[PDB]
Design a protein around this ligand. Structure first.
Ligand SMILES: CCC(=O)N[C@H]1CC[C@@H](N2C(=O)N(c3ccccc3Cl)Cc3cnc(Nc4ccc(N5CCN(C)CC5)c(C)c4)nc32)CC1
Length: 300
């Protein structure tokens, strides 16, 4: 079967980190911006701390441990990594802080200042991250612009492996809440998921970036999407996109999964375009646009 998963899961002391402000709140709990100060090491690491609220719920406790399991299992510059877990009465997951939030919100907030070089670099970075996940035989199942976070405007990372599944030595889902507008056709019909179905969602994610965060198939009921797709219709060519770029998205949306690009090929193609970005995206105005703190990426 598969190779042994020798990832390390680090257990952290609650007294080593401090919560500074709320990044986001849900029914499940809260995510804080914070600092992690390992005892004796003389480093201050910016972190996001996800803490369950009222964790007397066995389902939420099991789900956050599965998440910790997945994140520990990965190590690439284009996917978010776990620093560790803290087993307090309310369980906590400690991750690298991504100071600029999700790329979906970043692209909406800054559209008038985002040039073609940033857009095409982001496409490369997401594809390298996805290619890494495919190497590790991990299917993300939820790639979308909301699930990419921004470390710096120059460096984004895939995150939110809420639905992510490691292939046993395709993956078949049971029925549950699932993002139909981002899904390969075979995922909507037969709840099948593969690295190739991730490519489909990658295409949709690029579409979101290239439209500066427009909602795909806006207004259309998710019940209609499978037949719309079977009819051969897809998302439209974004205004800024040359046909070279749109062609790539379209290939990601072929019905024959094996006819879609590989992530390895998407890396190459978007890197080619990143060398001459204004040849490939046409954007108005494009030309013009705590002493001991250590980023988690330099903390090994
Ligand atoms: C409660 C549901 C919820 O709201 N989730 C969202 C908020 C938490 C967020 N998040 C995680 O879930 N992480 C994670 C993922 C999986 C497992 C464990 C963990 Cl820890 C790691 C993570 C790292 N960095 C950030 N940086 C960051 C986020 C938001 C914002 N702003 C604040 C001002 N707003 C107006 C706009 C948003 C900023 C400025 C920076 N957010 C993260 C994900 C999305």
């Amino acid at each position: 079967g598969e190779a042994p998963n020798q990832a390390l899961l680090r257990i952290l002391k609650e007294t080593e980190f401090k919560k500074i402000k709320v990044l986001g709140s849900g029914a499940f709990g809260t995510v804080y911006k914070g600092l992690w100060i390992p005892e004796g090491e003389k480093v201050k690491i910016p972190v996001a701390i996800k803490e369950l609220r009222e964790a007397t719920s066995p389902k939420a406790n099991k789900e956050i441990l599965d998440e910790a399991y997945v994140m520990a299992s990965v190590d690439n510059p284009h996917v978010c990594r776990l620093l560790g877990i803290c087993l307090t009465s309310t369980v906590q997951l400690i991750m690298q802080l991504m100071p600029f939030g999700s790329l979906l919100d970043y692209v909406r907030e800054h559209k008038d200042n985002i040039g073609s070089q940033y857009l095409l670099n982001w496409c490369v970075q997401i594809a390298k991250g996805m290619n890494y996940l495919e190497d590790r035989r991990l299917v993300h199942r939820d790639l979308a612009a909301r699930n990419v976070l921004v470390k710096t405007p120059q460096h984004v990372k895939i995150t939110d492996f809420g639905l992510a599944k490691l292939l046993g030595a395709e993956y078949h889902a049971e029925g549950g809440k699932v993002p139909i507008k981002w899904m390969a056709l075979e995922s909507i019909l037969h709840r099948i998921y593969t690295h190739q179905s991730d490519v489909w969602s990658y295409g949709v994610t690029v579409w979101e970036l290239m439209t500066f965060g427009s909602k795909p198939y806006d207004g259309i009921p998710a019940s209609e999407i499978s037949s719309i797709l079977e009819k051969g219709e897809r998302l439209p060519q974004p205004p800024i996109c040359t046909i070279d770029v749109y062609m790539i998205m379209v290939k990601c949306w072929m019905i024959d999964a094996d006819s879609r690009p590989k992530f390895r090929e998407l890396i190459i193609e978007f890197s080619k375009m990143a060398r001459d970005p204004q040849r490939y995206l046409v954007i108005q105005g494009d030309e013009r646009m705590m002493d001991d703190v250590v980023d988690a990426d330099e903390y090994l």
